């Protein structure tokens, strides 16, 4: 069937000092896919990791092609946009919705950790939604392998986004990969339930963070969060990564298992 490999780029989905993402529509089938265009003027590693991914809560990777200095990455199109835009400033979103999104985020993270991959930059801007509002973890440009041949590799590279980064990244030379992603998921949960980020960064120098360690939950954003989910956040946002709750235990949390959301 001629023309089936032709795609028209009809809309800009993203743009930054790195390249852009365009919505591509198949000339014949009208199928919609996202095309990441990067000028190799890093990408190799991102592609390598994307080739390992196959999960309903992770942006699907269809393949790639390069023409000289430009690399084209064909990725799953999530028409619902970024989770970031479903969060109402200073309000958040309905708890049931947040719980559903959190369940899907955990599913995706469990999957990634299961194959030894850590995302390292989990935040609402990198969590996309499909037409049925299903969450998809996106952008593996900062991702890396932390387990290979059943052997764990401690990380040392400082990366991510400050408001979402775990404290050990700023205090220790080396650290385990998994607790760092768990922490970021905790910050995302806080954002979904309060519509605001708790601190600029998890440092003792940051007043907001010191207040949290001092358990002053009568202050924002904590006072806007119900007791059940707040109890979970108390277990996730723990400074010592070794004492921080693991995903298997997050799955056993009272709030995590509370019936709240009706089916579509």
């Amino acid at each position: 069937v001629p023309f089936v490999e032709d795609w028209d780029l009809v809309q800009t989905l993203g743009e930054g000092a790195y390249g852009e993402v365009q919505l591509a529509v198949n000339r014949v089938t009208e199928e919609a896919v996202a095309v990441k265009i990067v000028d190799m003027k890093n990408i190799k590693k991102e592609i390598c990791i994307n080739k390992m991914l196959n999960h309903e809560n992770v942006v699907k990777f269809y393949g790639h092609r390069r023409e000289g200095n430009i690399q084209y990455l064909f990725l799953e199109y999530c028409s619902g946009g970024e989770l970031f835009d479903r969060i109402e400033p200073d309000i958040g979103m309905p708890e049931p919705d947040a719980q559903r999104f959190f369940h899907q985020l955990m599913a995706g993270v469990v999957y990634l950790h299961g194959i030894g991959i850590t995302h390292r930059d989990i935040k609402p801007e990198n969590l996309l939604l499909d037409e049925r509002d299903n969450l998809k973890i996106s952008d593996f440009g900062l991702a890396t392998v932390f387990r290979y041949n059943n052997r764990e590799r401690l990380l040392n590279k400082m990366c991510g986004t400050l408001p979402y980064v775990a404290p050990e990244l700023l205090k220790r030379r080396e650290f385990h990969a998994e607790p760092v992603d768990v922490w970021s998921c905790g910050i995302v949960l806080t954002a979904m339930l309060a519509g605001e980020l708790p601190w600029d960064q998890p440092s003792d120098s940051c007043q907001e963070y010191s207040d949290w360690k001092e358990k002053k939950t009568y202050l924002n954003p904590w006072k806007k969060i119900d007791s059940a989910p707040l109890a979970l956040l108390h277990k996730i946002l723990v400074e010592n990564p070794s004492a921080r709750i693991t995903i298997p235990d997050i799955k056993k949390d009272r709030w995590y298992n509370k019936p709240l959301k009706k089916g579509a």
Binding site: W7, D8, L9, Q22, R65, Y72
Partner: peptide, 5 residues
């Protein structure tokens, strides 16, 4: 703009 798969 357009691209080929």
């Amino acid at each position: 703009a357009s691209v080929s798969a």
